[PDB]
Design a protein around this motif. Structure first.
Motif, PDB file in Angstrom:
ATOM      1  N   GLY A   1       4.093 -11.185  -3.792  1.00 61.84           N
ATOM      2  CA  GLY A   1       5.537 -11.290  -3.947  1.00 61.84           C
ATOM      3  C   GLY A   1       5.989 -11.908  -5.255  1.00 61.84           C
TER       4      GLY A   1
ATOM      5  N   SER B   1       2.242  -4.556  -1.267  1.00 63.43           N
ATOM      6  CA  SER B   1       1.360  -3.410  -1.553  1.00 63.43           C
ATOM      7  C   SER B   1      -0.015  -3.618  -0.889  1.00 63.43           C
ATOM      8  CB  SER B   1       1.206  -3.179  -3.061  1.00 63.43           C
ATOM      9  OG  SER B   1       2.382  -2.677  -3.677  1.00 63.43           O
TER      10      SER B   1
ATOM     11  N   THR C   1       4.655  -4.903  -8.386  1.00 61.72           N
ATOM     12  CA  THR C   1       5.098  -3.538  -8.042  1.00 61.72           C
ATOM     13  C   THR C   1       6.443  -3.188  -8.713  1.00 61.72           C
ATOM     14  OG1 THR C   1       3.826  -3.684  -5.966  1.00 61.72           O
ATOM     15  CG2 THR C   1       5.432  -1.893  -6.096  1.00 61.72           C
TER      16      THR C   1
HETATM   17  O1  VO4 Z   1       2.403  -8.534  -2.121  1.00 57.71           O
HETATM   18  V1  VO4 Z   1       1.256  -7.821  -2.926  1.00 57.71           V
HETATM   19  O2  VO4 Z   1       0.996  -8.607  -4.248  1.00 57.71           O
HETATM   20  O3  VO4 Z   1      -0.060  -7.814  -2.058  1.00 57.71           O
HETATM   21  O4  VO4 Z   1       1.640  -6.357  -3.325  1.00 57.71           O
END
Ligand code: VO4
Ligand SMILES: Nc1ncnc2c1ncn2[C@@H]1O[C@H](COP(=O)(O)OP(=O)(O)O)[C@@H](O)[C@H]1O
Ligand SMILES: [Mg+2]
Lengths: 133, 133, 96, 192, 240
Positions: free
Chosen positions: E97, E149, E101
């Motif tokens: 977070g 992700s 992405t």
């Molecule tokens: O929240 V992730 O950094 O795993 O996409």
């Protein structure tokens, strides 16, 4: 085809494929075909729908009649003065992201250096192109 | 070919026995022949401006153009038909015929376009067919 | 069966995409972009969390190497700076 | 093209083993290129804007080696590349001494750098490479970005003056076929 | 007053924390530390990501006048791709977070923007339309991040010297297989499952015999809803 007025006409017909209105990018091709260059400031300062009439007025308003291909000669007084080898010069061409294909660049070479010399300079490319119009 | 018409058309526009290439084209167009600038420039290099009946007959033979057909004359129109319908606008057609070769004037082309069909969108194939008759 | 159907379908869309977007004769001078799964810690962490944190440590090992280890050797080999770069590497934790 | 396997699971079929080998290959693919790093910081777990949490941020200042990246000031040079990569990027400054047969590549660099006004202080030509100070690289890219524009339009001018000749030559072939349309129209005008 | 962290007299732990504190809170998340660039997650759009900004960094001459941003990097990366003709790579690093992405998307949107409008955007169309599908199929809601992700994304893109993506190759790896079958409490499964069992047309609801989001064993019935997320509107965008 006499003066420039009748020569700008012949050009518009081609680049639009006898269309009343020419494509925005094809008009950029068309202005380049007479040694006319613009800044993003002037490029944004162009209409939505481009007709023949505007083009003719634009050509008068722009096209330098004294030196049509000045932007070829504008590459200072050392590069324009020195000869660039045929192969090394095409290296610059492909690098500056050229749209011309193998045949097209060969066609260009057949216009620029028709004596098939071991090297070629810029001041010569412009001189041949002013006699090409 | 009509032997009676040839002799009559010659005497009708002859000056001091001889005939001017300009009159010889009008007389060829009276018979139904289509002389072009290429036909005129060939006869000019031989017998100058004014020609006798014998020299005049050898001119009418170049005006024949037996190899002429629809498929042969449409070649320039087809070069500009990118939509592939076999149709061009009256605006599109007029500019073609005005710009290159035996450059017909705007109204020469405009009237010849309406003389074919009242409609703006004209089939270039059916047009050649009509003007060749 | 449900796991394999979803994973192969997700990757089939990637293949369908690459079928239309890929250049013929591969890439010459391309632009790489790497979006991974960042370090994630919950009350309960498993193999899923293990594989994610491994990715992060891997991206770091290659970062520390390029940015520090390689640059330090480059300046020294060229005959510019003999000076050392002080940095903390994951060399030990990446090996475990 | 999936290997239909039966019996005991092979080392290449095991998820972890299949993961590491996929990761390993990807890293080398990245090592071969010129990487650029973006270091994203999550300021709080509450998922709130304009909320600073010094602990969480500090851990990320270490884990992304932001504080450690400060020792890279010691190097003093922003630009660093071989004579070839340099001379291809900055050839437009003066193609003249750039494609000189007599002058060596190490000395071609010196010429084009000094051509751009730079002094012996803004650069230090290494064993196999050319190094430039942050100050130095600014000067060179300002001159290069004026010259790129010079040739960018110069090419685009030649580009169309030939593209024009393309349409021209493809039109000249149809011209005698057209002359016949124009001669048959005059013929029709005589009849009416 | 300045963008590079290394310009401070004293670069100690708290002195750097404060320099970043006053930058984030005055809504200037991007701070350089060359070669590195620090992007703090603002959790709200500052409008610094919009097309106006893309066009700025794109058509602005002096790099010196421009403030730190994901686009400063995106331009300098593309400046070497064509400048020296060397393959370049962008790497979004950070915890769950942190904004990896999202930052990828911004740098992708930068390369999507072309100076001269004479390009075949048919290839560039599928490239950009893939991402909201890749997030529907590959991303899921976690307690750490609501658009976490669960897959690793890697791209290879041929971009023009003026702008615009000519060709690409999205190569995705390691999808969280367990997320499909079991999900923890307050944690949700892949967005597409919830998107399809909310936004599907009446025709697909009878042909496939679709039931409510709670009625599925592979879906946590209590975590079914995500704050600020309309799985119906997202689905519309996913289908197109
Ligand atoms: O929240 V992730 O950094 O795993 O996409
Ligand atoms: N620049 C930003 N502005 C606003 N919110 C942001 C920004 N970057 C990230 N976020 C927030 O963080 C969330 C997670 O971001 P994301 O890029 O998916 O991180 P990760 O790759 O670690 O999962 C987003 O859904 C968004 O709400
Ligand atoms: Mg992510």
């Amino acid at each position: 085809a006499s003066d420039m007025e009748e020569k700008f006409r012949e050009a518009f017909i081609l680049f639009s494929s006898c269309s009343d209105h020419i494509e925005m990018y094809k008009f950029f091709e068309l202005m380049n075909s007479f040694g006319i260059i613009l800044t993003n400031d002037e490029k944004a300062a162009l209409p939505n729908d481009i007709n023949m009439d505007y083009w003719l007025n634009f050509a008068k308003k722009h096209y330098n009649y004294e030196q049509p291909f000045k932007h070829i000669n504008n590459v200072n007084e050392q590069n324009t003065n020195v000869q660039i080898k045929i192969d090394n010069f095409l290296g610059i061409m492909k690098a500056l992201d050229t749209r011309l294909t193998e045949s097209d660049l060969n066609i260009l070479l057949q216009i620029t250096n028709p004596e098939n010399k071991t090297t070629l300079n810029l001041k010569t490319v412009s001189q041949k192109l002013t006699e090409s119009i | 070919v009509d032997e009676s018409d040839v002799r009559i058309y010659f005497n009708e526009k002859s000056s001091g026995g001889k005939i001017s290439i300009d009159n010889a084209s009008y007389n060829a167009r009276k018979l139904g022949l289509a002389p072009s600038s290429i036909d005129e420039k060939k006869i000019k290099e031989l017998y100058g401006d004014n020609l006798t009946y014998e020299q005049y007959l050898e001119y009418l033979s170049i005006c024949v153009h037996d190899k002429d057909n629809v498929e042969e004359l449409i070649k320039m129109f087809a070069h500009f038909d990118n939509n592939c319908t076999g149709y061009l606008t009256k605006s599109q057609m007029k500019n073609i015929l005005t710009t290159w070769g035996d450059a017909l004037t705007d109204q020469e082309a405009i009237d010849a376009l309406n003389a074919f069909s009242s409609e703006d969108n004209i089939d270039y194939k059916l047009f050649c067919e009509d003007i060749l008759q | 069966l449900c796991k394999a159907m979803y994973e192969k379908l997700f990757l089939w869309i990637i293949r369908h995409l690459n079928s239309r977007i890929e250049p013929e004769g591969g890439f010459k001078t391309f632009m790489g972009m790497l979006d991974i799964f960042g370090f994630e810690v919950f009350k309960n962490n498993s193999l899923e969390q293990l594989f994610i944190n491994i990715t992060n440590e891997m991206l770091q090992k290659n970062f520390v190497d390029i940015v520090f280890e390689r640059e330090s050797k480059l300046y020294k080999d060229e005959g510019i700076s003999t000076a050392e770069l002080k940095y903390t590497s994951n060399k030990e934790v990446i090996n475990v | 093209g999936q290997v239909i396997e039966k019996g005991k699971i092979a080392k290449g079929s095991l998820i972890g083993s299949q993961f590491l080998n996929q990761l390993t290959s990807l890293m080398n693919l990245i090592n071969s290129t010129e990487p650029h790093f973006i270091r994203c910081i999550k300021p709080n777990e509450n998922k709130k804007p304009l909320e600073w949490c010094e602990p969480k941020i500090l851990i990320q200042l270490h884990a992304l080696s932001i504080l450690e990246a400060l020792v890279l000031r010691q190097l003093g040079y922003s630009y660093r590349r071989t004579f070839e990569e340099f001379l291809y990027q900055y050839k437009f400054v003066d193609i003249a001494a750039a494609e000189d047969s007599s002058v060596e590549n190490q000395n071609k660099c010196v010429n084009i750098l000094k051509l751009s006004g730079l002094s012996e202080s803004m650069y230090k030509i290494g064993k196999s490479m050319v190094f430039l100070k942050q100050e130095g690289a600014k000067i060179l890219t300002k001159i290069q970005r004026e010259k790129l524009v010079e040739w960018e339009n110069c090419v685009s001018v030649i580009e169309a003056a030939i593209l024009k000749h393309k349409y021209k030559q493809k039109v000249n072939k149809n011209i005698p076929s057209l002359l016949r349309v124009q001669a048959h129209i005059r013929k029709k005008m005589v009849a009416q | 007053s300045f963008g590079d962290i290394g310009l401070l007299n004293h670069t100690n732990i708290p002195c750097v924390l404060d320099f970043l504190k006053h930058r984030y809170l005055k809504n200037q998340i991007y701070t350089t530390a060359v070669p590195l660039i620090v992007a703090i997650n603002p959790y709200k759009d500052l409008g610094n990501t919009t097309n106006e900004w893309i066009r700025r960094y794109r058509d602005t001459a002096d790099h010196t006048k421009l403030p730190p941003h994901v686009f400063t990097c995106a331009r300098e990366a593309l400046s070497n791709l064509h400048g020296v003709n060397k393959s370049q790579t962008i790497i979004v690093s950070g915890e769950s977070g942190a904004g990896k992405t999202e930052a990828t998307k911004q740098i992708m949107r930068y390369f999507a923007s072309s100076k001269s409008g004479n390009m075949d955007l048919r290839i560039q169309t599928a490239i950009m339309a893939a991402n909201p599908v890749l997030e529907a199929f590959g991303n899921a809601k976690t307690i750490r991040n609501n658009n976490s992700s669960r897959f690793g994304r890697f791209m290879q893109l041929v971009i023009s010297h003026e702008g615009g993506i000519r060709y690409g190759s999205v190569v995705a790896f390691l999808l969280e297989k367990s997320r499909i079958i079991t999900q923890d409490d307050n944690e949700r499964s892949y967005h597409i499952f919830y998107q399809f069992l909310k936004g599907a047309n009446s025709t697909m609801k009878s042909k496939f015999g679709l039931k409510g989001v709670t009625e599925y064993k592979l879906l946590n019935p209590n975590s079914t809803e995500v704050s600020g997320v309309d799985d119906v509107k997202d689905f519309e965008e996913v289908i197109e």
